[PDB]
Design a protein around this ligand. Sequence first.
Ligand SMILES: Cc1cc2nc3c(=O)[nH]c(=O)nc-3n(C[C@H](O)[C@H](O)[C@H](O)COP(=O)(O)O)c2cc1C
Length: 147
Amino acid sequence: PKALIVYGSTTGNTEYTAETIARELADAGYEVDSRDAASVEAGGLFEGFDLVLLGCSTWGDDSIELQDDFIPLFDSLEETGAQGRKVACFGCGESSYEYFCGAVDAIEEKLKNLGAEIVQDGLRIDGDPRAARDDIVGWAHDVRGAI
Ligand SMILES: Cc1cc2nc3c(=O)[nH]c(=O)nc-3n(C[C@H](O)[C@H](O)[C@H](O)COP(=O)(O)O)c2cc1C
């Protein structure tokens, strides 16, 4: 199959997390197209993939704020082709914030509402992603299995 990973990451944690997910999926036979959000265009971005993995980190405080490069992508999520698309969502952040991995919640939320098939609950990394490598890998293994 073809899986599309797109991530918004500012200190490279979620990017690190995407790359490990990309590797797991590619080890299991998939063709994996991994792309930073800052380099993509929403209009038809999911066209042709069987699996779309979205990746974002959380900024902000009192309300949910998304990583700046992911914002135009989230604002045009209706134009990507999410309808019927097997999807799953991930993101790094810090549990001391009110909204722990809040962006993960706002994307899964917008997706569900656009008719996507959320194949697994999002992966919410707290702190250093390198300390949670088993979790990322395990979560990739589980998304592959469900689709
Ligand atoms: C100003 C500020 C606001 C933040 N807000 C949140 C938050 O609201 N929720 C959350 O889970 N983490 C929050 N974080 C945690 C960061 O997202 C955390 O560093 C995360 O790993 C960054 O992941 P990344 O290298 O993939 O970009 C915040 C950090 C800063 C500086």
